């Protein structure tokens, strides 16, 4: 994860560059820091980057639910017994499980 990308076309003193990387990161965090405004001098720019691979494309709920349901189907245990439900769901499912399986 990245918060800010700043670009310059000159070789600006690697050591103090890393020091400023630490300083900005600590200062601009609202949990530990009280700064909000940044001023760029000397020609340093800010690249408007985006996020390439997010965690919202990985929607794995339906597949995992399907695998669990298919395993329960294979053994024969009704899903209501594992999850739990209302009385009309509780007792007939218990009878069906015991008898049929």
């Amino acid at each position: 994860v990245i918060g800010l990308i700043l670009e310059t076309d000159e070789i600006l003193n690697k050591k103090l560059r890393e020091r400023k990387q630490e300083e900005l990161q600590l200062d601009y965090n609202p949990s530990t820091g009280q700064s909000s405004v940044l001023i760029l001098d000397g020609g340093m720019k800010a690249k408007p980057y985006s996020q390439i691979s997010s965690f919202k494309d990985l929607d794995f709920k339906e597949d995992i639910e399907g695998f669990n349901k298919s395993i329960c189907l294979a053994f024969g245990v009704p899903q209501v017994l594992l999850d739990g439900g209302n009385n009309a769901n509780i007792r007939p499912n218990i009878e069906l499980f015991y008898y049929m399986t």
């Binding site: 298919s70 189907l73 294979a74 024969g76 049929m100």
Partner: peptide, 10 residues
């Protein structure tokens, strides 16, 4: 495959 085994056994 589980959906075939279960149905056939049933």
């Amino acid at each position: 495959i589980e959906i075939l085994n279960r149905t056939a056994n049933m």
